[PDB]
């Protein structure tokens, strides 16, 4: 469910998804970071917003597949959450779903842009953890 905030842990490099105050999105290995606590909320069934509890910014994906933090919950902020094996989830941009653009992190912690993601990568698998 979606009551409590979560960390989204990425198996690829072992990073928690992070939305920085300047709107940059990346990953960090630092479990104590203030900007990795995310409040997921559901829209329609299987659609979620992913919001920084610290800054209130929403996870968003731009027209080049780059993740960024959005002040407002625009249509670029809706993601399709799908449960995969081992309780890992994927998050697909709803706006770009027909191209299968996933939320993803590289092994160095940088965003893996939507067009470079693909089913099967560790980059796109996120395990929700309690804060
Ligand atoms: Cl990339």
TrEMBL record:
Recite the UniProt keywords alphabetically.
Angiogenesis, Cytoplasm, Developmental protein, Differentiation, Growth factor, Heparin-binding, Mitogen, Nucleus, Secreted
Q: Which domain of life is it from?
A: Eukaryota
GO BP terms: angiogenesis; branch elongation involved in ureteric bud branching; cell differentiation; cellular response to heat; epithelial cell proliferation; fibroblast growth factor receptor signaling pathway; lung development; organ induction
Give the main localization category. secreted
Keyword Nucleus tagged: yes
TM ranges are none
GO molecular function per UniProt: fibroblast growth factor receptor binding; growth factor activity; heparin binding; integrin binding; S100 protein binding
This protein's GO cellular component annotations are: cell cortex; cytosol; extracellular matrix; extracellular space; nucleoplasm
Location in the cell reads: Secreted; Cytoplasm; Cytoplasm, Cell cortex; Cytoplasm, Cytosol
Per the record, the similarity remark reads: Belongs to the heparin-binding growth factors family.
Function, as annotated: Plays an important role in the regulation of cell survival, cell division, angiogenesis, cell differentiation and cell migration. Functions as potent mitogen in vitro. Acts as a ligand for FGFR1 and integrins. Binds to FGFR1 in the presence of heparin leading to FGFR1 dimerization and activation via sequential autophosphorylation on tyrosine residues which act as docking sites for interacting proteins, leading to the activation of several signaling cascades. Binds to integrins.
Q: Under which name does UniProt file this protein?
A: Multifunctional fusion protein
Q: Note the residue range shown relative to the complete protein.
A: 22 to 152 of 155
């Amino acid at each position: 469910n979606y009551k409590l905030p979560k960390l989204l842990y990425c198996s690829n490099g072992g990073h928690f998804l992070r939305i920085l105050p300047d709107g940059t999105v990346d990953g960090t290995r630092d479990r104590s970071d203030q900007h990795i606590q995310l409040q997921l909320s559901a829209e329609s069934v299987g659609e979620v917003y992913i919001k920084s509890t610290e800054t209130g910014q929403y996870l968003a994906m731009d027209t080049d597949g780059l993740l960024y933090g959005s002040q407002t919950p625009s249509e670029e902020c809706l993601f399709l959450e799908r449960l995969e094996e081992n309780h890992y989830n994927t998050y697909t941009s709803k706006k770009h779903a027909e191209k299968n653009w996933f939320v993803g992190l590289k092994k160095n912690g940088s965003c893996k842009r939507g067009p470079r993601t693909h089913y099967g990568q560790k980059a796109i698998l996120f395990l929700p953890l309690p804060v």
